[PDB]
Amino acid sequence: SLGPQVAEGENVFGVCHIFASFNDTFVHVTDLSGKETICRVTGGMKVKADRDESSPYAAMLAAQDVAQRCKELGITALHIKLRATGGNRTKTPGPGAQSALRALARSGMKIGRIEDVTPIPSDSTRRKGGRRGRRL
RNA sequence: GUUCUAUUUUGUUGGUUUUCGGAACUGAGGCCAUGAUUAAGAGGGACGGCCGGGGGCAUUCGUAUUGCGCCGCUAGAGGUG
């Protein structure tokens, strides 16, 4: 729980995988390989109503909790892998992406590289909904 | 040339054969200014270099989706106005 044994003067790097969907936000810090989870706080566990799971306020609250727990383990800098739902469905990142990443930059973390890892398909299976679409 | 063959021919009655005309076939010739309109801003075809998500058969690659196995940390995740 103390963290890495290393002298100062260098950063130790983790990676946060941000999943900014339209229904909630996942802030999920892991090591370089991605195999070891270090802290996963979701935007939906910081609100009392499930209408606000995707709120930018929840994303800000989630990132602050992740950053504070990240400081405990000793990680100082993060690489960003922004991600929308992607795949067959919509590919634009949700409202929580902007606020979740801004919080990590204001909570003492150091931002490394930013990349987009949304899963675009070469072509996927037929999409949910009728031929007439989701009409309302 | 061959065949069939009308009738003028032999003084007046009978027999053959020509010529003579009519019909047919056939051999060797002369000659034509000897004999085929052009090649459609019609078409068919051949030929030459290309061109194309045209067609059929086989092969090869891609991420995504779903499902399963293992590993990590966690209490929520999904959807909706």
Ligand SMILES: [Mg+2]
């Ligand atoms: Mg229906």
Ligand SMILES: [Mg+2]
């Ligand atoms: Mg309407």
